[PDB]
Structure formats: structure tokens, C-alpha cells
């Protein structure tokens, strides 16, 4: 049939810079296998290429010395386009639903593949957005259990990069959807990235940025040499997990069946830094590279400042909860609590939603660095805590 | 040499508009053929058409019968909203704090450096269009151009505009000591052609219920794409198209025209339907072909109907305002006054403006229709009108 492509950066900002390279990369990959644009969905928050920031304008690179990625690229959805809301309708092939944007979504047939690419932030059951909301793993795989009821695609091939990324399918995604998931980590584990300036391969001098997350430059520089035709989604999974091994588990969820399937069958054919802390590691290099005494140093030392600000309140204000709720004392520190393999991080996602919510209407927003925390109040979640138990508590550790 | 850079922009929306964008994704696709850099090719275009609910091809723009894909490769610097007269004049200046929303692609061009501008959509004398209001007026363009000379940041320019009466934006206001050279697809009183419509010579596929391109715009497009660049001066391209355009209108060449004689590769590399008709075209071409009793048919003759009773309204309230602020006579009803050769359309532009304004504020909108109507608005400003007398006057005319 057709081969079809959705391929999302979930967040916005210069320092994430890497996430839409991965896309434009991906994009670049497709386009050379013989996908036509018609059928790859973008979504980028068009936000890097004419950066005030970035020091090559017009151009968006993945390695150090790669070429640019950026020209020729589709933007179906750019801006706040970028939304949990229009990625389930592009997913779902329906128009009525989306807003803004093209209006290009994968309305796909029973014989047609589907390669989806999501890059960016996560946490444990939940993927980041440019804005809020969130997508959690709930919303996620019923988008795609509605996707499979209605018989539009043979089978369905999910890439995703981000932390905790193995969280997003594990106790939910069934085996019996004809999808195929690889995420860039296990359930707990962080994704690092890769072309970073205090690393291995640096980036040009003018860049303070990682050009790359490892996962993605692992797969996408895989795809770049290693014939389609030649690998299978089992042998791209191997090569990727020999290269990021050190760092992270990409762990396969779904039909391992459809391992066995070809790169072309979804892709065509052609013929270390944290992700957590790399907004950090940008500010610092910023910072050190900025000449002594100049307005360039000072702006940059007062944003790690108040970043490391934020940093320490939403973290002493999450770890004062779990004790005010609780006790400090023996059997009472369950924040910590390890679910256990192939159990879904909560039962009740509604709940974990709430709790969440009223975190952020007492405490701050956990809008990118905060994300983190979702772990701890799903614990919270699972311990039978209520969203007016949990206001109670939130409201006596955020007192001004 | 230098960098070649182009700005082309698409100064209308809606699917019957299909013809503009389509010219503009066809003048992308001659120029990257040219050689020219995605980085150095600012677009605005609505994107509105490859996937509008109307387009029988979803995903391709055609600008021409039998014309392959021109959509597909496109960069999309300026789309929706953000096609406006502010982002248009500020990225031909190489301003980037004057843009609001998109890619933020600006001309930041050096003196060494080659300018194509390519602008087609509607206009009347002394305005060109917008997707939206407010709309580009002779002076507030040809004052922007006089800005961007006095900063040096060009060797020469060439600026192809096609609109009705496009030749009223630059007669009597373009220096011919600025280096720029116009092209205008009219005189300074003509209407422009469509060309590829339902009703005429080369028709679109059966599906199609909109033209395809514009004469002037469709005559130097594929005059480019044939004709080698090397081969071929600006003077050779003016006469093609003058050859192939007489019978509909005269195309216009305006600032130094010393400039006609340099190549086409120094910016670019190496019986008849009338444009404020085609609308009309499409609504009559959707009744023609819908079935009988059926929802679209009565949807289609209720869309003639309320064109019509706009069209017929918007006329007759004009005609009254003249008649009733001088009388019948025939040296009072003078609003067929016929500016001299070489002279600018008014002299009092803010005049114009404010008379435009009071008129739509008393009457219906003088937009894609009602633009038609601005000469007779000029020659009232001419008169001496005021905007006390002109909205005392249109108060009346429009009590019914």
C-alpha cells in the first residue's frame, strides 16, 4: 500500500534544539527512502532555524559536521499546532478534530504502514507537549486501540525518545494491535544526549547546544548508512542498543513479531550530557564562553541562577509532601516505591491527572524540569492519597 | 556576485484564490531548479488549499492542466494570519523585530546581493491585498522600497506584481534611482486575466471548479520554465509575456528599466475569465455540475445569491455617494476622472485610507469585491473631499 509517517519534537526553546534536528533528520531519511510528503505529518514548533540564538541561521544540523536538515522539511503543524489533541487526530486520520495546522493527517487504509516518531521530554506515563497538556500513556494507547478498530493500517512501527519512555507502553500496549514500539529507555532510566559540547563528538565551536539525543542519532545515522532492504527492525534495534548501551535500554514493547519485518516495509529505500540537565548544560556553556564582565556573562550566570532556583523549590517541595502526607519515620518514605516489571505505573490515570493538577495550582509548574516528579505522584496515586487529600498536604508545603 | 534572494507572497485566501498560492509554490519550484537556497526564499503563503475540504487532489497544487505537483518541497515561512502587509514589508527590509509569528526568515541581504519580489492576488488602483485586512497601499510599499535602497543592502531589485490595476502601485511613486525594476501584470486601469479556468480554451481536469493560474503569472512562469536563464534577459521575458498577454492587458514595466537588460540569472539562477470574476466562476461552476435536488445544488444557488445581492448592494451604494455628493450633471458625476500619465494615484494617501475606512464603516466591506471600487474613492479624495463629507454622504446611501 502506502507508507505513512508522523514525526513529532514534543517540546519548544532553543535547547532543544535536538529534538526538531531528529525530526528534520527523520524526514531527510523518509524523503531519500521515497516517501512522499503527502503522506509524512510534521509536527515542530518551528522555533530553531532563525533562533536569536542559533549561530548558522536558516540551517538546523544533527552531527557536527552533518549537513543541514532543515531545508526542504514539511510543516504541517507548527506553534502551538504542536498539541496532544491534534498528534491523536493526525494518528487517527481524522480532520474535524484538528485545529490549525494544514490539516494533513494519516487517513491510512488496511494495507498501508505507519512509522511514528516522537522525540522530546517524558517522564513515567506521560510525554511532553511544547505547552500543557501532556499526552499520558492512557490518552496514548487508546488513540491507537481506536486507530486499530478501525482497521486503517497492516501494522504500525513506534519510535519513541524520551525519559522514562519505556512507561509509556509497558503494562498497557497490547501485543495483538500489529504495533511494534522502541522506546530509547526502560520504564525508570533517562535518555542522554549525544553532540554535545562537554562530550565525545563536540558541535561546532559557535554551538551551546547537543546537536543530537543518542537514541535518535543512533537509529537515524543507522538508517542513513545500513540498506533497508538489508535490516530488519530487530537488526536496527541491536545496532542501536550496541551504541547506547552505556546510557540507556532501548527496550521493544508490542509485536516483537514485526521485528522480523525489513526497514523499507515503513522507511523506503535510499538507492555524556542527561536530557534532564542539558538545558543546563546550555547556560553553563553560555556562561563559560562568555567574555568576563560583559552583559552576556551576567545574563547568563542570573538564568542558571534561577533556573537552579526553580530546580531546588519544586524538588523541596515534592520531597516536603511525601513526608507531610505520611511521616518521615520506618515504612513511610514509599515515594521511592518501585513498580513492579510489566505493571502499569498507576490504575487510576484520571487520578494521577488530579493530583498532578493540584500540585501545580499550589506549588508551581511542573512544565518541563517539574515532569520529572510524575513517578513520585503516581506513588502518591497508587497509595490511595485523594485529590482533596492531596490539595491538604500541597497547600501547607507552599506557604509563602 | 552575491546571494540571490526572493520574497514571493500569495496575497489572498480561499479555495477559489487556488490560482495565487499555486503560482507561488510554481515560482519556489523554478527558482530551487535556479539554484537558489531555501535560506534566501522567504514564502507566505495561507496554506489553505493543498488540503482544503474543496481541493479534488489532497496534497497537490497544480498551476496548470496536466501540471505536475508544484505543493511538495515548498518552505512555508509566513502562513494564515501571519500573511500580512507588516511581516511582507518587514521581511523585504531585513527586520526580524518586526515580525510577528512565523519562521522569522527575513531578507538580511548585503549590498552585492540580488532581490526577486513575486506578489500575486487581488488589487485596485493604488491597493493590493491581504488574506485579511488592512491591505497594501501604492505609498506604504514604494516607501518601504525607498527604505530598504537607503540602507545599501542590494545591488539591484526586480518586483513582479500581478493584481488588477497593478500598474497604479508604482506609477509616479517608483523612483527610477533606486536600482529596482517592476513588472506589473496591468496598466494603471485594466483587470488581469485568469487563464486554466473551467470556462475557457485549456481547461483543468473535470474535477476542478477553480482556475488553475493567472495569464501574467502562468506566461512568465512558464516562460521560465522553458527558456534558459543565461539565454534570456528581462526585456526578452517582459516581451514574451507581453506577446502572450495583449489581448487581456498591457504588462507594465516601472523604475529603471536600464535593468531589462541584464539576464534572468542574476535574480532567478540557471474566451477569458476576469480575476474579479472568478469567484462567481466557481460558484457557478459548483451549481452547474452539482446533481439536481441535491444539498450542494441549493447550497451552491444560495452562495450565487448572496454574491450577487452583495455585488448588486456594494455598486449601486457606491454609485450613490457620487451622485449625492455632487449631483447628476455630467461635470458633477466626474468619478471616471482619468489621473495624467506619470502621475500618482492621489496625492493624500492617509485621505484615501480614511475615506475607505468611512465608507465601509456606513456601508458593507470593500474587501475582496468591494477593493474594485477604490479608484472611485481616489478621485472623490482627489476632488477634495473630506472625511466629515464623505461619511455624512455615505450615511445616507446606505439607509437601505
Redesign the interface.
Known sequence: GTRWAVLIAGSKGYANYRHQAGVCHAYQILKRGGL???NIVVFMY?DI???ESNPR???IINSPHGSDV???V??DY??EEVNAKNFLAAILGN?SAIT?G???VV?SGPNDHIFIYYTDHGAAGVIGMPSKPYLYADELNDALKKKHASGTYKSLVFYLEACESGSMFEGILPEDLNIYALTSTNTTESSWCYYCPAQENPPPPEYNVCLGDLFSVAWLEDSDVQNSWYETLNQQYHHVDKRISHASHATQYGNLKLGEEGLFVYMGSNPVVNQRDADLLHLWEKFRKAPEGSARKEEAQTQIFKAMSHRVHIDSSIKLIGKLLFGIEKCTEILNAVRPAGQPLVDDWACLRSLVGTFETHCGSLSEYGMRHTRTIANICNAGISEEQMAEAASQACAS
Open positions: 512522499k510528503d503527502e518551528d532555524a532563525y533562533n541561521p536558516g540551517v532543515y531545508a526542504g514539511p510543516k507548527t506553534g480532520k490549525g494544514s490539516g494533513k487517513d
